[PDB]
Amino acid sequence: VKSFEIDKGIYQTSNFRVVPSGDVVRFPNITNLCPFGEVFNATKFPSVYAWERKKISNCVADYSVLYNSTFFSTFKCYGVSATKLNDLCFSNVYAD
Amino acid sequence: YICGDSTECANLLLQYGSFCTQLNRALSGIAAEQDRNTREVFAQVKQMYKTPTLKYFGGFNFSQILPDPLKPTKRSFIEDLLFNKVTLAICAQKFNGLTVLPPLLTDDMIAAYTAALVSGTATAGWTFGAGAALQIPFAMQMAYRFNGIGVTQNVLYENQKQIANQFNKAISQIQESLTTTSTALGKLQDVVNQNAQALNTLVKQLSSNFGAISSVLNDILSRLDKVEAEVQIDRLITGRLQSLQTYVTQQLIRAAEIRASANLAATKMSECVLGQSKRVDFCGKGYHLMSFPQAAPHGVVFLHVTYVPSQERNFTT
Amino acid sequence: IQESLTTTSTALGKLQDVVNQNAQALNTLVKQLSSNFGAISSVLNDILSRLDKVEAEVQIDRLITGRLQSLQTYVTQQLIRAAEIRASANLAATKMSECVLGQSKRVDFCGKGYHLMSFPQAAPHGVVFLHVTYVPSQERNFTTAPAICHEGKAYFPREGVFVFNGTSWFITQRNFFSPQIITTDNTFVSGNCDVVIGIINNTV
Amino acid sequence: GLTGTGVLTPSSKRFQPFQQFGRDVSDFTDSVRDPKTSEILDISPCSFGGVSVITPGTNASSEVAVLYQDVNCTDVSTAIHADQLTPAWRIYSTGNNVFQTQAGCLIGAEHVDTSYECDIPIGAGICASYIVAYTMSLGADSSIAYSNNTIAIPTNFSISITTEVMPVSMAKTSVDCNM
């Protein structure tokens, strides 16, 4: 309220909050290397009208070889970031 | 409300200046205004009184008007019907960010002030307020109140018992016309419905998007990193800021209407109760013999002992 | 009064409340000039010394948008304070008609009493009255007579209650202890003696 | 996928097996299932609330009390004694904790049954003095009795000039748009 001498009364001030204590992270016990070393490094790379689709589940994602090796001409992400993608558990990645 | 919490949002919030300080000041002022409202409406007799428990005056039944010692609680039966009539639509523990503050005046003591006003109305003489009380036995009250219509006690004492009867039944019919009835207790429900829809629409604004990817924080926070991040977050904060500012300004407009009605509320608990208000079709649709306060959720409900003059003759002048 | 207004304190508070509302509104407005709105600076030209083009005009659009909304918020709250201040101003005009030019016969609105006179005095941005009210305070013990039954017939007094049935002696006002000799000239004939709950004879 | 911050507890539902989240009023999660076979409610308000200083006015005192709003007055002790409050002071320790009238914690004021006539509005009836924190004497409670027969008149009186403050004109301001 910007005074040394302040009159008497309940005066508003800041908003307190209890700082949190620790950390709780809860994932499944799903524990598996992905087929990214072969679903990307594949053999049968199809046509365009006959584009291939795989659903991949039950895995643990790496996102690490994709950056430390510049084999890729165009990297692009749309509804998502690139690097912070390795925070979240996902449902059913789709290789197209 | 805004900005719910991450880390980045507080920095982007204090980008926009003292908006947090502005809104919290304005709602603090509205809170203090509602404090002033209930003080100036009710706390108008300083020196309180006693529920006298004579309760029968020739035939003058104040049944259920006053809370009674025979009750379990201390809220009067009429007002208990009033509480039961009015709906909604430990402490509040919800991360909207919001709250209803508790009121200042204690709810039973809201009722105790109503009891005080009604009881000293039922006693104490006309001079009541500007003084304290002057020992008048309440039939001398209406014998005095016949001057605020300009007639004699030949009304009162020549018709004594009859008058009380037309009192009691109608009050009992009050018990009908407030239990059995409907929307003719509207404006309290109307006030709560305004605030319900306004605040719930504000909640839905927290569900609302503003042209961003998500409509909720911590969602984008896993797939935002940088400039993309702060663009989407600026959209969210901008919209939540505009919507909340809209809410605050409408709360202020509402509170202005409430305080004009509160001026009226003090005016009808003063002019109509503490004396007889000689002005015409102000208190009620009669010549306004008495009127009694009653509490209610978030508002006051009066009881206007009006006066309908009704028989008909023909004469020559 | 030369006590209550002179050495005294915040029991004249509302006018400073008005001025403090003005000051906080205006200082908030100036501090909004000192605030950014997601652009680079809080002050123009400073940026335009180091801004180039379309980047530049986007940032200046940000600043102009924010300055505009903050200003408009000031406008709206001024208008709201104006509405409240004019409802109270209508009250002021009201009591300067009602309570000043005559005795406003309505009760316990002019001050806290029965309002014998009133004296306005000007003020910065407001007006401060001096309410020449009334407060009656002494007390007693006296007994009742809602009527007068002299010869077997009633006399309701003048209706304006409490006949002085202090030893059944006289007639009385509402507010001041006042001896009033009963004659025929002072009360009215109202029928026989029906419900004279305090009976008094010799009323001649 | 869900980050955030809050107070967990086990679930209290008729939770369907295909569902996972709760979003109860408007997208506000409030209930989840652990990914390693347990079921939990998530009331994310750890706590919050405004605070407010209660001070006698730096002209007869310098001792405050600090009203917290949205707490039930045992969370505050754990926030103090593991240093979890955001206005984390130093020169500060708990005198007491008067709490009911659910407006929240009040640090540094005593209960008083002999309730006074309420200087300062602490929340829900409760008010301060000196610094104590009583509930409220609602005025001075005058018991009264009024029989039928018994009457009094005022026999002397007063005049009492009092103030009243009626604002009229605010500052006649104006604003250049151009500057």
Coordinates of C-alpha atoms in Angstrom, one line a residue, chain B:
Chain B
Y1 CA -8.7 -18.4 -12.7
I2 CA -6.4 -17.3 -15.4
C3 CA -3.1 -18.8 -16.0
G4 CA -3.9 -21.7 -13.7
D5 CA -0.4 -22.6 -12.9
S6 CA 2.7 -23.5 -14.6
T7 CA 5.8 -21.3 -14.3
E8 CA 5.8 -19.5 -17.6
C9 CA 2.3 -18.2 -17.2
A10 CA 3.1 -16.0 -14.2
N11 CA 5.9 -14.3 -16.2
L12 CA 3.6 -13.8 -19.1
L13 CA 0.9 -12.5 -16.7
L14 CA 3.1 -9.8 -15.2
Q15 CA 3.9 -8.8 -18.7
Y16 CA 0.4 -7.3 -18.8
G17 CA 0.9 -5.1 -15.8
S18 CA -1.1 -4.8 -12.7
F19 CA -4.2 -6.7 -14.1
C20 CA -4.0 -9.1 -11.2
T21 CA -3.9 -6.1 -8.8
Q22 CA -6.7 -4.4 -10.6
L23 CA -9.1 -7.3 -10.5
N24 CA -8.4 -8.3 -7.0
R25 CA -8.8 -4.6 -5.8
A26 CA -12.1 -4.3 -7.7
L27 CA -13.5 -7.5 -6.2
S28 CA -12.3 -6.5 -2.7
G29 CA -14.2 -3.3 -3.1
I30 CA -17.3 -5.3 -4.1
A31 CA -16.8 -7.5 -1.1
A32 CA -16.6 -4.4 1.2
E33 CA -19.7 -3.0 -0.5
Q34 CA -21.7 -6.1 0.3
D35 CA -20.5 -5.8 3.9
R36 CA -21.7 -2.2 3.9
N37 CA -24.9 -3.4 2.4
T38 CA -25.9 -5.8 5.1
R39 CA -24.7 -3.4 7.8
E40 CA -26.7 -0.5 6.5
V41 CA -29.7 -2.6 5.8
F42 CA -29.9 -4.5 9.1
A43 CA -27.7 -3.0 11.8
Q44 CA -29.8 0.1 12.1
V45 CA -30.9 -0.5 15.6
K46 CA -27.6 -0.6 17.6
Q47 CA -28.9 -1.5 21.0
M48 CA -30.5 -4.9 20.4
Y49 CA -33.5 -6.3 22.2
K50 CA -34.9 -9.5 23.7
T51 CA -37.4 -12.0 22.2
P52 CA -39.9 -11.0 24.9
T53 CA -41.9 -14.3 25.0
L54 CA -45.2 -12.7 26.0
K55 CA -46.3 -13.6 22.5
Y56 CA -50.0 -13.0 23.0
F57 CA -51.5 -9.6 23.2
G58 CA -55.3 -9.7 23.6
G59 CA -55.4 -11.7 20.4
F60 CA -52.4 -10.4 18.6
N61 CA -50.7 -13.6 17.5
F62 CA -47.1 -13.2 16.3
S63 CA -47.1 -16.9 15.5
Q64 CA -43.8 -18.1 13.9
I65 CA -42.8 -14.6 13.0
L66 CA -40.1 -14.5 15.7
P67 CA -37.9 -17.5 16.3
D68 CA -38.9 -19.1 19.5
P69 CA -37.2 -20.7 22.5
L70 CA -39.3 -23.9 22.1
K71 CA -37.6 -24.4 18.7
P72 CA -34.4 -26.4 18.4
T73 CA -32.7 -23.6 16.5
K74 CA -33.2 -19.8 16.4
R75 CA -34.4 -19.1 12.8
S76 CA -38.1 -18.4 12.6
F77 CA -40.6 -20.8 10.9
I78 CA -41.5 -18.4 8.1
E79 CA -37.9 -17.9 7.4
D80 CA -37.4 -21.6 7.5
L81 CA -39.9 -22.0 4.7
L82 CA -38.0 -19.2 3.0
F83 CA -34.7 -21.0 3.3
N84 CA -36.3 -24.3 2.1
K85 CA -37.9 -22.4 -0.8
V86 CA -34.6 -21.1 -2.4
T87 CA -32.4 -23.5 -4.2
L88 CA -28.9 -23.4 -5.8
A89 CA -27.9 -24.5 -9.2
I90 CA -15.2 -27.7 5.8
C91 CA -14.5 -25.4 2.9
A92 CA -14.6 -24.9 -0.8
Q93 CA -11.8 -27.0 -2.4
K94 CA -12.0 -26.6 -6.2
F95 CA -9.3 -25.6 -8.6
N96 CA -11.4 -23.3 -10.6
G97 CA -9.6 -20.6 -8.8
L98 CA -12.8 -19.2 -7.5
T99 CA -14.7 -19.0 -4.3
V100 CA -17.8 -17.7 -2.8
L101 CA -16.6 -15.9 0.2
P102 CA -18.5 -16.5 3.5
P103 CA -20.6 -13.5 4.3
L104 CA -19.8 -11.1 7.1
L105 CA -22.9 -11.3 9.2
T106 CA -23.6 -14.5 11.0
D107 CA -26.6 -16.3 9.5
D108 CA -28.3 -16.9 12.8
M109 CA -27.3 -13.4 13.8
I110 CA -28.8 -12.1 10.6
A111 CA -31.9 -13.8 12.0
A112 CA -31.2 -12.4 15.4
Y113 CA -31.2 -8.9 14.0
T114 CA -34.4 -9.6 12.2
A115 CA -35.8 -10.9 15.5
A116 CA -34.6 -7.7 17.2
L117 CA -36.2 -5.5 14.7
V118 CA -39.5 -7.4 14.7
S119 CA -39.5 -7.6 18.5
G120 CA -38.8 -4.0 19.2
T121 CA -41.4 -3.2 16.4
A122 CA -43.8 -5.3 18.4
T123 CA -42.9 -3.3 21.6
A124 CA -41.0 -0.2 22.4
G125 CA -43.2 2.5 21.0
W126 CA -43.0 4.5 17.8
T127 CA -39.8 6.3 18.7
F128 CA -37.5 3.4 18.1
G129 CA -34.1 3.9 16.5
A130 CA -33.9 7.7 17.1
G131 CA -33.7 6.9 20.8
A132 CA -34.2 3.3 22.0
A133 CA -37.7 2.5 23.1
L134 CA -40.6 4.0 25.1
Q135 CA -42.9 1.4 26.6
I136 CA -46.0 1.1 24.4
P137 CA -48.3 -2.0 24.5
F138 CA -48.7 -2.5 20.7
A139 CA -52.4 -1.8 20.5
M140 CA -51.6 1.7 21.4
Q141 CA -49.2 1.3 18.4
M142 CA -52.0 0.8 15.8
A143 CA -54.1 3.3 17.7
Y144 CA -51.2 5.7 17.0
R145 CA -50.7 4.4 13.4
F146 CA -54.2 5.4 12.6
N147 CA -52.9 8.9 12.3
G148 CA -50.8 7.9 9.3
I149 CA -54.1 7.3 7.5
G150 CA -55.9 10.0 9.5
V151 CA -58.6 8.0 11.4
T152 CA -59.7 7.3 14.9
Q153 CA -59.4 4.5 17.6
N154 CA -63.1 4.1 16.9
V155 CA -61.6 1.9 14.2
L156 CA -59.5 0.0 16.6
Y157 CA -61.2 -0.5 20.0
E158 CA -64.7 -0.5 18.6
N159 CA -63.6 -3.4 16.4
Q160 CA -60.8 -4.9 18.5
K161 CA -60.9 -8.7 18.2
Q162 CA -62.1 -8.6 14.6
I163 CA -59.0 -6.7 13.5
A164 CA -56.7 -9.3 15.1
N165 CA -58.6 -12.0 13.3
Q166 CA -58.0 -10.4 9.9
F167 CA -54.4 -10.2 11.0
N168 CA -53.9 -13.9 11.9
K169 CA -55.7 -15.7 9.1
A170 CA -53.8 -13.7 6.5
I171 CA -50.5 -14.5 8.2
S172 CA -51.6 -18.1 8.2
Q173 CA -52.5 -17.6 4.6
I174 CA -49.0 -16.3 4.3
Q175 CA -48.0 -19.8 5.4
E176 CA -50.2 -21.0 2.5
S177 CA -49.1 -18.3 0.1
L178 CA -45.4 -19.1 0.7
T179 CA -45.6 -22.9 1.0
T180 CA -48.1 -23.6 -1.7
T181 CA -46.9 -20.9 -4.1
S182 CA -44.4 -20.5 -6.8
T183 CA -42.5 -17.7 -8.7
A184 CA -44.0 -15.0 -6.4
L185 CA -40.8 -15.0 -4.4
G186 CA -38.9 -14.4 -7.6
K187 CA -36.1 -11.8 -7.2
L188 CA -33.9 -13.8 -4.8
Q189 CA -33.9 -16.8 -7.1
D190 CA -33.3 -14.3 -9.9
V191 CA -30.2 -12.9 -8.2
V192 CA -28.8 -16.3 -7.5
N193 CA -29.6 -17.4 -11.1
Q194 CA -27.8 -14.4 -12.6
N195 CA -24.8 -15.1 -10.5
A196 CA -25.0 -18.8 -11.1
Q197 CA -25.1 -18.4 -14.9
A198 CA -22.5 -15.7 -14.9
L199 CA -20.0 -17.6 -12.8
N200 CA -20.7 -20.9 -14.5
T201 CA -20.3 -19.3 -17.8
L202 CA -17.0 -18.0 -16.5
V203 CA -16.2 -21.6 -15.7
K204 CA -17.1 -22.6 -19.2
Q205 CA -14.8 -19.9 -20.4
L206 CA -12.1 -21.8 -18.6
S207 CA -13.3 -24.7 -20.7
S208 CA -13.3 -22.5 -23.7
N209 CA -10.5 -22.2 -26.2
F210 CA -9.4 -18.9 -27.8
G211 CA -8.1 -20.1 -31.2
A212 CA -5.3 -22.1 -29.6
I213 CA -4.5 -25.8 -29.8
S214 CA -5.8 -26.9 -26.4
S215 CA -8.5 -25.3 -24.3
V216 CA -6.7 -26.3 -21.1
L217 CA -3.3 -25.6 -19.6
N218 CA -0.8 -28.4 -18.9
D219 CA -2.0 -30.1 -22.1
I220 CA 0.1 -27.9 -24.4
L221 CA 2.8 -27.9 -21.8
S222 CA 4.1 -31.3 -22.9
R223 CA 4.1 -30.4 -26.6
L224 CA 5.1 -26.8 -26.3
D225 CA 8.8 -25.8 -26.1
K226 CA 9.3 -22.2 -27.2
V227 CA 7.9 -19.4 -29.4
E228 CA 5.0 -21.6 -30.5
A229 CA 4.6 -22.0 -26.8
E230 CA 4.2 -18.4 -25.9
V231 CA 2.1 -17.6 -28.9
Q232 CA -0.5 -20.2 -27.9
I233 CA -0.2 -19.2 -24.3
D234 CA -0.7 -15.5 -25.2
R235 CA -3.8 -16.5 -27.0
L236 CA -5.1 -18.3 -24.0
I237 CA -4.2 -15.6 -21.5
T238 CA -5.6 -12.9 -23.8
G239 CA -9.0 -14.6 -24.0
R240 CA -9.2 -15.5 -20.4
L241 CA -8.2 -12.0 -19.5
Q242 CA -10.9 -10.5 -21.7
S243 CA -13.5 -12.9 -20.4
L244 CA -12.6 -12.3 -16.8
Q245 CA -12.5 -8.6 -17.3
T246 CA -16.0 -8.8 -18.7
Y247 CA -17.1 -10.8 -15.6
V248 CA -15.6 -8.2 -13.3
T249 CA -17.3 -5.3 -15.0
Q250 CA -20.6 -7.1 -15.0
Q251 CA -20.2 -7.9 -11.3
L252 CA -19.7 -4.2 -10.8
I253 CA -22.8 -3.3 -12.7
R254 CA -24.9 -5.9 -10.8
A255 CA -23.5 -4.6 -7.5
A256 CA -24.6 -1.1 -8.4
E257 CA -28.1 -2.3 -9.0
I258 CA -27.9 -4.2 -5.7
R259 CA -26.9 -1.1 -3.9
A260 CA -29.7 1.0 -5.4
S261 CA -32.0 -1.7 -4.1
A262 CA -30.1 -1.6 -0.9
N263 CA -30.8 2.1 -0.5
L264 CA -34.4 1.0 -1.0
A265 CA -33.9 -1.8 1.5
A266 CA -32.6 0.5 4.2
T267 CA -35.4 2.9 3.2
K268 CA -38.1 0.3 3.6
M269 CA -36.7 -1.1 6.9
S270 CA -36.4 2.4 8.2
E271 CA -39.4 4.3 6.7
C272 CA -41.8 1.4 6.6
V273 CA -40.9 -0.3 9.9
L274 CA -39.4 2.1 12.3
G275 CA -42.1 4.6 11.6
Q276 CA -45.0 4.6 9.2
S277 CA -44.0 5.8 5.8
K278 CA -46.7 8.3 4.9
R279 CA -45.8 8.3 1.2
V280 CA -48.2 6.5 -1.1
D281 CA -47.8 3.1 -2.8
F282 CA -44.2 3.0 -1.6
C283 CA -44.3 0.3 1.1
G284 CA -47.3 -1.6 -0.1
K285 CA -50.6 -1.4 -1.9
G286 CA -52.6 -0.1 1.1
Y287 CA -52.2 2.8 3.5
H288 CA -49.4 0.9 5.2
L289 CA -50.2 0.3 8.8
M290 CA -47.1 -1.7 9.7
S291 CA -44.4 -3.7 8.0
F292 CA -42.0 -6.4 9.4
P293 CA -38.6 -7.5 8.2
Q294 CA -37.7 -11.0 7.4
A295 CA -34.4 -12.5 6.5
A296 CA -33.8 -14.7 3.5
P297 CA -30.8 -16.0 1.6
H298 CA -28.8 -13.2 0.0
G299 CA -31.7 -10.7 0.5
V300 CA -34.5 -9.4 2.6
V301 CA -38.2 -10.1 2.5
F302 CA -40.6 -7.7 3.9
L303 CA -44.1 -8.2 5.2
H304 CA -46.3 -5.2 4.5
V305 CA -49.2 -4.8 6.9
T306 CA -51.1 -2.7 4.3
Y307 CA -54.7 -1.5 4.6
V308 CA -57.2 -2.2 1.9
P309 CA -60.2 0.1 2.5
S310 CA -63.2 -1.9 1.2
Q311 CA -66.9 -1.2 1.5
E312 CA -69.1 1.0 -0.7
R313 CA -72.0 3.5 -0.2
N314 CA -73.8 6.3 -1.9
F315 CA -74.5 9.7 -0.3
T316 CA -75.5 13.3 -1.1
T317 CA -73.1 16.1 -0.5

